[PDB]
């Protein structure tokens, strides 16, 4: 699986937009959306939000968790804990990239938000590195990774799974 | 305060009586041999205690004093009185040290306080001097004796003690030193240099200072290729009240191995299985070089040598064999020298324009440990009981060849410089290579004019070979075929399009891990290089003796050669046959007997030796 | 670069002396008085350090001036051939005693000489005499 | 040793990890097949000699040549199969009609296999729906925008957008068109997606 | 003082936020935290250094950049501590055995125009300076303490973790605990780093007219050690400062290096793709030949020989341990005014390692190696000559015939065996000289005189045999060539003003240099079997021809034909293959090698 | 997507993959043996090869000739799998050059267990511990060596470890291209070179 595909799944997440156009309810296959009333918030999937923002048809509102105080608390909790902590969104990195790259004008203090999300990303990838090293050193049979996100797993998981396949075959080659 | 745990670990490791008894047996051998350092393999320490092995290699000084105290406890338990007979028992480490295997170049500052194994070539050694570790003193005014330990930054504990002795006051009474009851240890400093071929590109070889103590001082001389295991440390150079951060660094050695010096039953069986093994060895001498069969036989004779006689009258007959190769450009003379440098033990390279009479024999140099000046050995002194290869020998200065004359004639060199007047041993075989005058050999000139060297010098060589770039088409065919085959060769442990890597350190254990014919070809069963090295190393020692039949045949054929000189052409004789030629005949026959491992110089040896002399004297 | 060839009593040396006087950074040398090493550059034990040091010769001291070589025909060949690199490539490259470097010698060489036998004969070409 | 000519086929393919297709090694294939023929003839002579004459010491060398034959078969079959894998990737990475510079590298039987594979794939794609099937060769990357701006790299002919509407693909001309219409030409290198 | 500590903490926090917050890119494409990611990847690789650009720091916070320019000694410590803590928060949690945090060396670089050694006046003291030069000497790596612990000698009390000032300046030990000097430095309980002093010679372009080249002492620290070797050309960014241990109030000066930039081997993947494309395109041989000395009209076969010399053959170590040289030795005898010296001056510039020497300006010791007494130690030490300085490269010996015979004799070992065996002053070693010798010379009689034949060459057969290819480049008069050559020369002189534009079907000099380095390190070819058979047969025919010519003349030819010439053809073919990164030399490669050697053999007829 | 993928190596399993080029090249590597009975007609290769002859021949051929009764030949380990080199690996696995010590170190070692040597357990444990020791350096180098010369990092690795290194590098490059937005562009395939 590619990072673009993980972004494709991340684009299904719901975000709130303020349209500058009028449109009645539209019945999409994945779920009806709207009605789109000018100047009023409406919740839509992230791909449609980014598309309308690109076409100058709405203002994006940040999610409730894109807040400097909340993100600082989450970052400090992540650095304080040893296990992966529950993240505000299951696709927080991709949400941050899309929303801040396309709507930094709408989202206040986007620099702080981006830096805090990067801090959490660095901490959690370091934790994943430690988990992989502990797995291979202790010859564990399985691991528990409850609060990892899909992008975090996808970044390093192909290498880790291939290495563990090799390790399993090496430790089991005396089967008779 | 915490080192008792490490001492307990090392004492538990040493007490091998429970399971395998390896190291209790080694300590017992140490006691029986009256030695006072134990040789410990860190691989065994890994197998029994990986944690302690890592701590030892990364925290060397504290771990080593713990190990030495554990060894003293164990040797006291085995034999208490013997434990009192020595001040302290050392431990020298061997085995595999992982990433700590370094060269003098890669031995950077991050290795400080770690056990490191440094491979390199010894460039110089300081003179052995005693070093006080504990001095005992007696008070006549009190009839009482006192003691003082001494330490410096070199010692493992590393506290600097005051250098002076208690002198005129203890109890405000005069003391005097009991030298006999005091204990001193030998101290020596050597310098280990990087292997010259392994330097990166234009970088000159780097070096590191090494300190040897107690029984290690004898185990290295200049020119030796050694592996030194020790601990790397910095020595602060304080002025007193001020210092620059720049500290010199040393390697306090705990073990030294001669990596190039060094079963016979299979050799003594192979000399029976093979038929005329001298021929097979000579053919297999330098596989990359085609032809020159008689020259290869002469080189093998040079490698094996005769036996040096001491006569009842006190005179001695030189046993080494000296060979001079004269010939055209591109006829593999330099390559034969290079093969001899690779194959022989203690073979010194030299080239005519890049050497001097001083550097060939000995030079006065200041020992910076003290400032006093001493002799530092030159090429032919380093080559003692070995070989010296001199390329471009016709390009030497006459004053430089004056040095070679004494070495070849008498096996010594006389020196009178600094405070020293001495006859240094330079008992080495000379394998010299030269071009004739005018570059290329001239058929229309006598050999004595093609050969620009003086007849006095030429008399000192046992065999003189003239080898020519004769452009015969069949000889060119076979030579070119061999050359192109060699250039087509690639090693099995190398990928199909690799450029060979420039040199870097690749030795990762103190002892070689993978422990007779070539397999590729059918013709004549070529001998492998490693087996040839081992066989020559064994066969040099046999020391055969003449027999009546071989002596009679040598005398008869020498008389024929002498009488043949009566009508032989003076314009084209290679060198005049004399008693020196007879000495050459005896030495070559002895060398052939050594090759056969026969213990008696037989008529076969005489026949081959005099055939070689006939070829060298009366064939181009 | 200029070469003044001809018979005696024709003010060639006088021309060189004039050029020495008028031009800045000029130097003058003659025949056997010059040397290869002095013309190009010389390596010496430094007086107080006693380590090898490279030092400027004639064509380096005149690096942006004129080097005047009087009686040029009467130099030794080893002295005369030393100025080839300086005269065309305008550098002096030295590989001596551990020093391996190239100095700048962007110098105009003006030389004076006599032909063979002193007197120029019109019966022969310039190369022939 | 016998096998080295077969190893050259293997080393030829292993020395190109990028998946590009080398020229078919017809001469090497002929040589390894000839070697197998010679080995089989020797093996048959030796085995019938041993069985008829009751001579027992031949059996080790019989097994030697048998294993050598099986080795030759394994090497050549692996060579052909890996070439098939490389050829199969071309239909997806480039398209149906391969360029002639690449088609010159393929054997005639390789083109036969490729045409059969293309027909089978098109049959499978048609059978996925009631009418017109589903062209699964398209939509190779996740979709970002409904329209894209494309730039013509090759001077090229008229390209139909829909029925009477078409665009001339002259070099350096720049169009704004649907992504699903432009995907194949971008993958073939006729068009460059910008932004 | 608390105010001072507050100032240091505030500046450290500002540097910390620079390393935490700096980004490059745009919202249209994306952003990467440049120095965060550099810190993370370098720490995970175990590198423990980063390279902070002064322009980036100025863009983030101009006051920090100005402070670091004016007072680098004060602020670089704060920047390094900031980098250390940023690395800690970026990398943690770390696996077992990596719990302790390591110090980070913050190197730095700049896009600013550099100064010069003679521009370094007194007012530049203690500021950041950026100067170019050539490294002429390089010390062996030595350990300098960064933190020490000192123990009282009498009562055994200890003062620990005393911070040592950076650079060559030292530290004053206290005179109070006991004796007047109570302390000794504990050799175990101190932390040290690699350091290396260098000598940076002024650029020859930068020397004013008539002056000797100045040189400046450099101090390299930690990972800057062994980042540069003698003969390299560098731009050094550092702090001009006094050493701090005739006349009275004088202090010696040196530059504390904190950034090294080699002005011209680790290639980028994009450059590797370019080099693979260059090796793959079919006319790379002609492209390289056109790229070599593009200002020189004609001489295309000599340029091809120079291409083969630059790429070189493959060194081979055979089972008995004997080594065959891959380097190609090329002599250019001929008439004057024929661009031989200019071709040498191009090759010196173009080779990855290249040393230019004048034959008349050289000596035996200076070419091979010199033995000299170390003034500060009284020992005899080794000094690399041109052939050691050019190890792994090319030696350009111009005016080669002007050397004395005893000095030409000195290079015989280094040309063929590629070693310099030394036995002088009690030091006995065998240095490496794995280099190619490109030589230029004139005829004995100035011009080549065809009536005199072999008398036009004074070189011995032994040294002539060591040259793989010998060109007798005669200057043959012809009106058409002369007209076209003069037009080329005049347009070349006119083209000294036209912006130094590139040319079609040509490789830039820098790109050609890097491509040569890449091909040298990567590819070692061999001969194909049938190609070797062809070369064998042609060698027999050639040798028979040479023998019959010598018999017909009843005189030995000056230029010999030997096994070295066979191996010369071998390594020329291997060089041609190495241009194309092919593991084997084909019959066509051997054919081109034979063609080049036939040009060089017609020149020996 | 539908990109070309080589037949995966099955060398570490009980039997190697038939169609794997890597396994074929691995099994080509030679293996010392001692012949247990004389073999006629093969003296042209090494007319009979006599009994007790030492030979080095390919691993595929050794496996073919080897029956567990040890009737035709006895199979001996290469030096790199014997106790001394196992101890060298036990010292520090990171410094040994498995590219020079047979490029398919793990695959050759795993298939070397087929001959039922008495030290099969020691060989297996040595391979496992070597991989465990080298894993962390492989992981860090592959996942942190971004956009630079990877030659020195990849030089000392065997082919399995090189595959792991390329997997890690591919993941790193994919994530970096995503983070810098270059993953969104539709591009021509590698076959545009033609
Ligand atoms: N018979 C031969 N067999 C193989 N290689 C040879 C032979 N003769 C010469 N060569 C090659 O020729 C090259 C030069 O060899 P070299 O030892 O320098 O010759 P030489 O006799 O010493 N001539 P010189 O050094 O000029 O006095 C080397 O690469 C040799 O391998
Ligand atoms: N045309 C002239 N006008 C004035 N003085 C002249 C002229 N020709 C020669 N002289 C004088 O002749 C004298 C000798 O000049 P000088 O330069 O030494 O001649 P030269 O060319 O060097 N002869 P030589 O040194 O033998 O080659 C000087 O005093 C000149 O002034
Ligand atoms: N074919 C050519 N194309 C361009 N410039 C040339 C050519 N031939 C000679 N020159 C120029 O002529 C001048 C002298 O060239 P140079 O490099 O010294 O040749 P040379 O043969 O080495 N001279 P010499 O040292 O006397 O043998 C330089 O400015 C060259 O650029
Ligand atoms: Mg030679
Ligand atoms: Mg005059
Ligand atoms: Mg010139
Ligand atoms: Zn005190």
Numbering used by the authors:
A (entry chain E): 1 to 176
B (entry chain 3): 10 to 271, 281 to 533, 552 to 656
C (entry chain 2): 518 to 646
D (entry chain D): 1 to 195
E (entry chain 5): 21 to 197, 207 to 274, 285 to 303, 312 to 652
F (entry chain F): 2 to 47, 58 to 205
Excerpt from the paper describing this PDB structure:
We have determined a 3.2 Å cryo‐EM structure of a human replisome comprising CMG, Pol ε, TIMELESS‐TIPIN, CLASPIN and AND‐1 bound to replication fork DNA. However, despite our MCM3 construct lacking these amino acids, we observed almost identical density in this region that we attribute to MCM3 residues 524‐533. In contrast to the hsCMG:ssDNA:ATP‐γ‐S structure, where ssDNA is held in the C‐tier pore by MCM6, 4, 7 and 3 (Rzechorzek et al, 2020), we observe 11 nt of ssDNA bound on the opposite side of the pore engaging MCM3, 5, 2 and 6. The SepB trimer is bound near‐perpendicular to the N‐tier face of CMG where it forms an extensive interface with CDC45 and the PSF2 subunit of GINS. TIMELESS‐TIPIN sits at the leading edge of the replisome in advance of MCM2, 6, 4 and 7 where it cradles the parental DNA duplex prior to strand separation. TIMELESS and TIPIN form a positively charged, concave groove that grips a complete turn of dsDNA ahead of the fork junction. Pol ε forms two multi‐subunit interfaces with CMG, one involving MCM2 and CDC45 (docking site 1) and the other involving MCM5 and PSF1 (docking site 2). Our structure shows that CLASPIN adopts an extended and flexible configuration stretching across one side of the replisome, from its N‐terminal association with TIMELESS, across MCM6 and MCM2, towards CDC45. Here, an invariant phenylalanine (MCM7 F285) stacks against the final base pair in a manner characteristic of separation pins in diverse helicases (Velankar et al, 1999; Gao et al, 2019). Although we observe only a single unpaired lagging‐strand nucleotide after strand separation, it is positioned at the mouth of a positively charged channel formed between the MCM3 and MCM5 ZnFs, strongly indicating that the unwound lagging‐strand template exits the secondary ZnF ring through this channel.
